Amino acid sequence: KIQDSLSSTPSALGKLQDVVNQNAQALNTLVKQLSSNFGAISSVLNDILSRLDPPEAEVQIDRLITGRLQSLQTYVTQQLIRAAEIRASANLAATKMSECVLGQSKRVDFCGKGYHLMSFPQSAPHGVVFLHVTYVPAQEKNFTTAPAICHDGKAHFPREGVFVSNGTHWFVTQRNFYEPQIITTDNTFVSGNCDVVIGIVNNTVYDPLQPELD
Amino acid sequence: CTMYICGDSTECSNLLLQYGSFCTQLNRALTGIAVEQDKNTQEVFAQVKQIYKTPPIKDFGGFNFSQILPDPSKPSKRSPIEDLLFNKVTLQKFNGLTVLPPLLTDEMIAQYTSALLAGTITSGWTFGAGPALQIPFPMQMAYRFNGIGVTQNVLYENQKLIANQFNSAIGKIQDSLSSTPSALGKLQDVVNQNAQALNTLVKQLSSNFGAISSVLNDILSRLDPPEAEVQIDRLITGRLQSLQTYVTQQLIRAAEIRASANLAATKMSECVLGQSKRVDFCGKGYHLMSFPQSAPHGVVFLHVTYVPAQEKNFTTAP
Amino acid sequence: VNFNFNGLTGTGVLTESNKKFLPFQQFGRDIADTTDAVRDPQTLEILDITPCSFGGVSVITPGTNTSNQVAVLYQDVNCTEVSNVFQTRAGCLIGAEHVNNSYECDIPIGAGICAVASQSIIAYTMSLGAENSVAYSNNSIAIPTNFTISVTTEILPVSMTKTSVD
């Protein structure tokens, strides 16, 4: 789908076309400034040297020098700022490459929408394109929950996952994918008692030793 | 560029025209900054594809958010803290210089922060990764506790104490912001710097730059064109140099604001939308959760963190 | 009007004022060293000078590959002085029809309003996304039952053409 998406959605490469366009526009205006007089009798420096004597040609040339030197300084300053912006983007790209392609990132939305799984680098003219493969949870289901389970007066909390009910039966499941498991002593742990937690339901917790000794 | 440097003078306009593209490149630079400012606001606040809304019943396990959620009784649906921030920072356009409105109005930005806060309250970080999955808020905070190496039973056994501490800290935040000045200096300084830059740019119009008089109309009205033209060209050059200085300073300041906006968007994504394991990235302590609040030309994050308290020495062995 | 008061010349709108000039002062200036008001001679009254309205003109266009219809935005003038005309807080946009129902923003105008659809250019308040509420309770959790794996593309520039000027 990525190929069709980029082949059919224009502006998808806008972040690189805009940098190319900005540099072309800055260079085009820099060239176009040669047509300006800045007060000189003519924008063509060679024709003034070919028609004016040095003692007076020098004033016209000095005016042309001042105008072109300040135009060049403006171009250079804008290029220095644009270079700093591109450098910041390149540093971000290198950080993304290291922490998305070379590893796996736990910092949310740094490597695309979703829970980051892995990434793919691709080169592009004057840039890089990252293909981020992410895990996105889909169709959710409602379940009734409780933060802890009272068994014989003792309060049980899940070691991983949450307690959920389908209305009639209680199960333990990991938060990021519905997978109901029976509540046992090996997926739950004990801390305190039920009379302290304000959210508790009374259920039974199965101890594999019960069936192993019987 | 044309109205600022020269104004309503055709005799002067003809001299301004001999400098080529300077006015179009300064308008290009200023439009570039204006567009990136809306990009900054969009990237920092518009991180949610949908507008989430909090339930009408605030049964959040004892956690009191009335100080960060919008107040339906107010004329602009602002939270108490956000209303205080808009009332704490305090913020000229007649010489051809105008200021464009932002694309996102304060009401719309407030609505985005309300959506982010309602999402974080009702679904934790799940609304950032994909669809918003409701979870009871005490269970959400218990998982956030589990994320920093404290077993979730610590929250449930201490739920009342935790709720009271959270409510007290949130209450303290308004008193601190209302009682300790300079707290909003990071935004007052940017507002002041922009106002100072515009005031200086306008004040430069009173300067002579070597001309006999700073007002173009009296020199044009009293001196003959063959000699007044030189004084006009000198004043145009000085005023154009002033405008170029203003534009360059704005380009650098815009780069600074862009870096800050990128940091703010990163903090919003990795503190508000999720939970950060990055030390001291989301405030001092072990990060639990964050709350965005809008402010004039900025964002304020309320970082809720877990800080170890009284400690005891024990003898150990590996 | 183009005024000339005791040698101070300029262009602007002269209006009545409530600024109490002292008997010895003839014109007053605002911050930034510019004239805010002046005292007329012959009648000794205080006139405020507000520059007559001006502002940039912006063109809203879908593109020459779609239609040659355009809309014109007058940013900081009112248009009740020199086919539909809609006043917005960014200025008055002429040629775009104002539609009450919101959509995703396409061409940004300002102050929350964006603006081609249904064979014409329209102007509207931008939507922030679909409105929904989460079924929050104190004992209900939504848990997904099926992953989907998605691939997203993020494009970042790294370098620019290495130009050099002698």
Ligand SMILES: *[C@@H]1O[C@H](CO)[C@@H](O[C@@H]2O[C@H](CO)[C@@H](O)[C@H](O)[C@H]2NC(C)=O)[C@H](O)[C@H]1NC(C)=O
């Ligand atoms: C300047 O001279 C004019 C004309 O003499 C004055 O205008 C007159 O003022 C008197 C007193 O208020 C009125 O009764 C007349 O009707 C006015 N005439 C006109 C044609 O307006 C004016 O007041 C003088 N201004 C001064 C002395 O400051």
Ligand SMILES: *[C@@H]1O[C@H](CO)[C@@H](O[C@@H]2O[C@H](CO)[C@@H](O)[C@H](O)[C@H]2NC(C)=O)[C@H](O)[C@H]1NC(C)=O
């Ligand atoms: C999880 O979602 C996938 C698709 O995202 C489901 O796979 C589809 O299953 C139906 C019926 O079995 C087929 O008609 C489709 O062609 C399948 N699509 C794909 C892309 O394989 C899958 O069945 C879902 N599983 C659950 C438990 O909901």
Ligand SMILES: *[C@@H]1O[C@H](CO)[C@@H](O)[C@H](O)[C@H]1NC(C)=O
């Ligand atoms: C959970 O129940 C609420 C009850 O109002 C409902 O709106 C919501 O759609 C349910 N969740 C799912 C995933 O169907």
Ligand SMILES: *[C@@H]1O[C@H](CO)[C@@H](O)[C@H](O)[C@H]1NC(C)=O
């Ligand atoms: C809940 O799941 C258990 C285990 O499959 C099943 O026996 C029970 O009937 C289910 N109840 C409902 C209401 O789905």
Ligand SMILES: *[C@@H]1O[C@H](CO)[C@@H](O)[C@H](O)[C@H]1NC(C)=O
């Ligand atoms: C859940 O909320 C309802 C609302 O009244 C309340 O009656 C019930 O006791 C609550 N349950 C828990 C476990 O907090």
Ligand SMILES: *[C@@H]1O[C@H](CO)[C@@H](O)[C@H](O)[C@H]1NC(C)=O
């Ligand atoms: C759970 O059991 C205890 C005694 O075994 C009882 O006092 C308590 O009320 C029960 N829980 C509920 C919700 O009724």
Ligand SMILES: *[C@@H]1O[C@H](CO)[C@@H](O)[C@H](O)[C@H]1NC(C)=O
């Ligand atoms: C939260 O605290 C405020 C005062 O700070 C109080 O007015 C409000 O009723 C409290 N909300 C709840 C649900 O207790």
Ligand SMILES: *[C@@H]1O[C@H](CO)[C@@H](O)[C@H](O)[C@H]1NC(C)=O
């Ligand atoms: C602009 O037009 C609106 C509506 O006609 C009016 O309320 C407002 O006063 C006008 N502003 C100016 C400066 O004329």
